[PDB]
Design a protein around this ligand. Structure first.
Ligand SMILES: *[C@@H]1O[C@H](CO)[C@@H](O[C@@H]2O[C@H](CO)[C@@H](O)[C@H](O)[C@H]2NC(C)=O)[C@H](O)[C@H]1NC(C)=O
Ligand SMILES: *[C@@H]1O[C@H](CO)[C@@H](O[C@@H]2O[C@H](CO)[C@@H](O)[C@H](O)[C@H]2NC(C)=O)[C@H](O)[C@H]1NC(C)=O
Ligand SMILES: *[C@@H]1O[C@H](CO)[C@@H](O[C@@H]2O[C@H](CO)[C@@H](O)[C@H](O)[C@H]2NC(C)=O)[C@H](O)[C@H]1NC(C)=O
Ligand SMILES: *[C@@H]1O[C@H](CO)[C@@H](O[C@@H]2O[C@H](CO)[C@@H](O)[C@H](O)[C@H]2NC(C)=O)[C@H](O)[C@H]1NC(C)=O
Ligand SMILES: *[C@@H]1O[C@H](CO)[C@@H](O[C@@H]2O[C@H](CO)[C@@H](O)[C@H](O)[C@H]2NC(C)=O)[C@H](O)[C@H]1NC(C)=O
Ligand SMILES: *[C@@H]1O[C@H](CO)[C@@H](O[C@@H]2O[C@H](CO)[C@@H](O)[C@H](O)[C@H]2NC(C)=O)[C@H](O)[C@H]1NC(C)=O
Ligand SMILES: *[C@@H]1O[C@H](CO)[C@@H](O)[C@H](O)[C@H]1NC(C)=O
Ligand SMILES: *[C@@H]1O[C@H](CO)[C@@H](O)[C@H](O)[C@H]1NC(C)=O
Ligand SMILES: *[C@@H]1O[C@H](CO)[C@@H](O)[C@H](O)[C@H]1NC(C)=O
Lengths: 319, 168, 168, 319, 168, 319
């Protein structure tokens, strides 16, 4: 006779396994993945301003090597370097390569403010058969090769530039290391060169070393690229009796800049994504990801786990 | 023969997380309970909200991949990043494991609250059978079952009928 | 008309965290319960103690502010510190959120323990009304109400009076 | 007829909002802030022994530039550098500036142990119009400018010092970089200088570079400051045929020292506080703080959050 | 005179974590309950399992001890490691404190589940004494006590005897 | 008349104290320690392949100093350096000592691939009274001291080596810094030396500095050890007119290698342990340890705590 009333909860035939602190295998009605594993495979140019270096890395571009003409005046949040990039000019090493690359990347700009220098007592606009532009001998667009005047000697240089702007100045310069004692004298008359760039803050001086390196684009010598920062108010002095690779102007610095460089071989699509990785973009609202530790922008946190299932429902007890 | 949550769950119930199932002389029925359901659901959303808040944004960082060996500075950079990855991987494993233990606790609690709510409504007119069900010791037609479900069941109405059925 | 914790809290109660409120033929009164209150309080202090322990002391560390750009080493130092700040910020958000969920659980439990304690004292002499209150089925003057509150209430004294009031 | 007994909990009219894992807005009876936001605005000289560098930074003081006389023999837990500090002596750069600054800071002492050197064949106690002390030409109190003897040449130097003490020795020395080829010969006769300081452990040699820098306190030349550590037992040798800026003694090192340097522009009050920041002191028992990531001493942990409310009571349900 | 968990624990009980203790006309006895015990135990192992999983393996790292002072780079390396040690020390303190709070909750719950399980079996044939014990209002010999313990006790068998002993 | 049935839980007379978030002192029936404090005191040679450097540190071995002959061709997961190790050859400093030491350690091998060089115009196989091998003058087994030919001059060197293997090459070389201007001319005729090693990637040039250092094994001069990496395809050129300490071959690099170096004074036993520390091995299944932050292999995480007791049972309420 007596009525019954029962209280219950829902269940499904096939649950989902999740982890608590004490059970590695609790079956719950519904669950949600928290580790993103998918990427797009193309780098999204929104909302991040991208510059594709293509054949040129960020430094070749900043120096103005042949391949790199387009890159002039480009600005970016992320500069993309491709692994297919190649040297196309006179061979060079850079001491503190990654330090300079970082500085250029952070500034997020290849807008070269050109300046005019009067180099007393030297031939200007040197070129080389290693740095072809349309098959014709050329040089770095942002550097000026100085050799002895078609006349006397490497007329001593003592050129100065005062930073009158409100911003900090980056000057890129270099030093020629010739192969033979004869190549030194042909170009610079003197037997030993010297380059001395200096501000009020600090200084560098390089005595160029002669000797043979392996031929690169048919060249036994080398150039060594250096840089100087010049604060507003301060002045820079280039002082050389031989072997200077003079600049053609400065870059802007800011220091209050957020830009960076990414090393990817993935095409620039037309998608949208705030998270860029070397493997591709990430389009997810999940809090974690196993794709790549290299992750630029608004990204999920990189973790080792492949899956982290989050219970979105009660225990499944199906009967 | 009907049972409740003590035994197992209800695949039958598809429009709610919790609910009533009854037997009377008019038949047998299952209805979902909205309050208990929305209660549970609302704490599953709020923690699903606590997780899609992206305070992680990183522009220029450090190199994480290298082409040549360097020794000291590369060794440190590799160490700093590997340390960061280990510590976040731990935070994720613990957070999820800890959220999930809470999600289970909250849903187990809401079920028991629902049972106890009904217990109180029924006063001395029903006995707990032990299987998540109440034996009601008075005739309870479909209007009476609905009153229990919508919270208007006046136990005084049936107290004499039910007590006389329990004591003799 | 009086209610208990099921309905809402008591702004009236100012000398304790939990307490009894009664109605009898002598009047109506509210008294605080010291055991249940001190129970809760003691777990709020102990976790307030777990937090003012300063194992954080740091003399010479690293530069955290820079005047000129430098590239690699500055980039790393900025990264290490920003990583440290992110990880502690997370620990704080979680610790507080997790303490607070515990503080709520502990206080909700102590309330229910208090209710169940009284339930046991009263045996078959009272019925649970559903509103955090017990209907006592015998005359209970002010000494009898105090016995319930101070834990000396002998249910055998009133069992015959109360059972006869419940069954008829 | 039947008496009632009810069980309840306390409540307030106006609660406080706190966060759990699932609700961003739980109203509880009482709550407590855990993120300290207040600082004192003055640096407390208790219980931390402070030294105010005032007009001198930590290196100028260690070198003994004009402004810096007071700082001699001072000891500290925290050396305070002011942003108003100024160069007052001969212009100089320091390679690894921040490395030396760190070493000096950590040692926590400007107690200069003076030693006597007999520099065979040179004029001693050089001064300069850039380094005024009471309006009269002076030099770094801890350095000794060597020029050719009022006579012949820069008589070759080969001076040695054996560390007989039980502690590690820090020797500060330098190198003059003259402006002109004529200034070099006036001071050092020779056309190219050389400085070579060395222990059994390691060595440095500097060939000074001639050339023009911008005039600073009316000076085109520069000095370059270097340092050498000398272990107990070991010996140091200064070896120069030109351009040495000799030392006058060493500093003590310890290595088991906890001191540091803080960069603040805030006055030294008379308060008490174990936590010093660039913004000021922190007087709190809270575990967190949003004031500054720069925090020296027994401090609360720096976090990004402005507020973290900690429930100190139950849910508020006021009815 | 016998008590239950409300009062204190049982040093007597050595073959189980939980158990029954009874008095009838045949004597007095203590038997352990296997289900409730294994329940608790199984969550203590599973978290003991979650802790001996060694995802920490580290070959080449960074220098952690130095013979001479160096300044910037040494200062950073010392900082990175001291930061790592602080953050893991925190994770350990919290994990243990949090596991332990769970271990206590789970075992307190299993005890109460055991009590409520018996409550349900006994229906209207027993009253809760308040001391973790049930007064059984009918003669219950050793077979009847074993039926309660092994889950076969049919309350209908004794309902008339027990209700008549409770109401008069 | 009425039977009683009671439900209880077990208890012990003497509990154990554990910590929750709110109570620093909860007494539970059983508890388990999670911080390992014991170490073995001997370094277990299983499962980690150990090489005991004994009297030689990792660099002396890589250079081939007298003590170090055994170490040739040894391979390791962990190279052990003893604090009793000693210099036994010509005195030398190494710029970036710890960088080279790291590179060698990571490679996990002292298997020296020997190459033959024809050094045009110099005496080979120089020795010295500081580097005794059986009481007789010797040199680093992996270096070749070049002095002027018993004849004319330091015949200019322009030697090249192309990396034809598939792996990256590490070449160890050096530079002699003689004591006197007379010692320079005796050995190298020329008044100033020069060493220039270079690949296509980068370059170094060292002009050796003359002067006096303190005598070490009766020697006022010094050698400065340098290293060059040579990629597959690339070539290395040694170019010197004076003071070269030539190599005898290269080491293999890999870069995909996990090995390291440990600094311990503990004997190599015969135990088994995946966790090695400077204090000894760790044989534990616990997740934490207070022994040493220096921990190599599969180890428990280092923490500051001495004890962290984990409840393995319920509250103890004994009555
Ligand atoms: C990220 O995690 C996913 C899933 O955990 C990995 O994808 C699996 O990879 C394994 C190994 O090849 C395969 O057996 C499975 O078929 C994959 N499953 C899925 C769903 O993709 C992936 O390898 C991880 N990625 C990284 C970069 O670690
Ligand atoms: C709560 O339930 C009661 C009882 O089922 C509802 O009232 C009854 O409704 C049925 C059909 O709608 C009528 O036939 C009965 O005569 C009604 N009885 C009474 C006593 O009202 C009531 O409408 C429900 N209330 C709410 C708010 O849903
Ligand atoms: C616990 O409460 C009882 C009952 O209220 C107290 O005993 C009574 O106290 C009142 C007031 O003093 C007297 O008028 C009654 O005659 C007492 N009755 C009995 C039966 O004792 C008792 O004192 C309280 N106990 C404690 C420890 O506070
Ligand atoms: C630390 O946090 C406090 C509080 O969140 C910040 O003070 C607030 O500042 C904002 C911006 O001006 C205003 O909305 C309020 O007037 C301030 N609130 C209070 C309570 O003072 C403070 O800016 C933070 N400090 C730092 C250094 O970030
Ligand atoms: C559960 O307990 C019952 C009652 O104690 C067991 O059955 C009794 O066992 C005793 C002793 O073996 C006999 O003397 C009784 O005659 C039995 N009576 C009945 C009604 O069975 C029963 O065997 C137990 N069941 C299980 C599965 O262990
Ligand atoms: C690791 O922790 C253990 C235990 O906390 C420390 O050992 C104690 O050391 C103190 C100080 O010498 C002694 O008073 C005790 O006798 C030791 N107790 C035990 C149980 O061994 C040990 O010092 C710590 N080790 C390190 C390296 O910090
Ligand atoms: C230029 O050179 C002359 C001679 O070398 C030198 O005296 C002067 O200081 C230099 N000044 C500038 C501004 O270049
Ligand atoms: C000093 O110089 C002489 C001459 O070069 C040299 O032989 C000697 O070793 C040097 N010793 C000391 C202690 O200066
Ligand atoms: C070798 O020396 C010659 C002579 O100076 C030089 O021209 C050449 O570049 C060097 N090259 C190699 C491969 O040794």
């Amino acid at each position: 006779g007596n009525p019954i009333i029962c209280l219950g909860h829902h269940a499904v035939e096939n649950g989902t396994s999740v982890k608590t602190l004490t059970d590695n295998h609790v079956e719950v009605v519904s669950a949600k993945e928290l580790v993103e594993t998918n990427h797009t495979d193309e780098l999204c140019p929104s909302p991040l301003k991208l510059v594709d270096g293509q054949d040129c890395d960020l430094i070749n571009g900043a120096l103005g090597s042949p391949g790199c003409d387009r890159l002039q005046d480009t600005t970016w949040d992320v500069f993309i370097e491709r692994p297919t990039a190649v040297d196309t000019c006179y061979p060079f090493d850079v001491p503190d390569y990654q330090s300079l690359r970082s500085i250029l990347a952070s500034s997020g700009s290849l807008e070269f403010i050109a300046e005019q220098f009067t180099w007393n007592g030297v031939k200007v606009d040197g070129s080389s058969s290693a740095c072809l532009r349309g098959g014709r001998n050329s040089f770095f667009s942002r550097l000026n090769w100085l050799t002895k005047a078609t006349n006397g000697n490497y007329g001593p240089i003592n050129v100065t530039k005062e930073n009158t702007g409100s911003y900090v100045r980056l000057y890129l310069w270099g030093v020629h290391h010739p192969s033979s004692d004869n190549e030194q004298t042909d170009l610079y008359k003197v037997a030993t060169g010297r380059v001395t760039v200096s501000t009020r803050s600090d200084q560098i001086s390089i005595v160029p070393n002669i000797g043979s390196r392996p031929r690169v684009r048919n060249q036994s010598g080398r150039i060594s690229i250096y840089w100087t920062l010049v604060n507003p108010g301060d002045s820079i002095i280039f002082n050389s009796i031989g072997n200077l690779i003079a600049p053609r102007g400065h870059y802007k610095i800011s220091k209050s800049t957020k830009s960076t460089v990414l090393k990817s071989d993935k095409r620039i699509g037309s998608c949208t994504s705030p998270c860029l990785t070397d493997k591709g973009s990430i389009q997810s609202d999940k809090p974690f990801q196993n794709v790549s530790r290299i992750a630029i922008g608004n990204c999920p946190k990189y973790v080792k786990q492949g899956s982290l299932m989050l219970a979105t429902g009660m225990r499944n007890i199906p009967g | 023969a009907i049972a409740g949550f003590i035994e197992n769950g209800w695949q039958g119930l598809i429009d709610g997380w919790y609910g009533f199932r009854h037997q009377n002389a008019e038949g047998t029925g299952t209805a979902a309970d909205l309050k208990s359901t929305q209660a549970a659901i609302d704490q599953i959303n709020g923690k699903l909200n606590r997780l899609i808040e992206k305070t992680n944004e990183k522009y220029h960082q450090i190199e994480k991949e290298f082409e040549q060996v360097e020794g000291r500075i590369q060794d440190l950079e590799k160490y700093v990043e590997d340390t960061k990855i280990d510590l976040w991987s731990y935070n994720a494993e613990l957070l999820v494991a800890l959220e999930n233990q809470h999600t289970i606790d909250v849903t187990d609690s809401e079920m028991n609250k629902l049972f106890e709510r009904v217990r109180r409504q029924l006063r001395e007119n029903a006995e707990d059978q032990g299987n998540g069900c109440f034996e009601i010791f008075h005739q309870c037609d479909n209007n009476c079952i609905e009153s229990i479900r919508n919270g208007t069941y006046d136990h005084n109405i049936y107290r004499d009928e039910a007590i006389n059925n329990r004591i003799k």
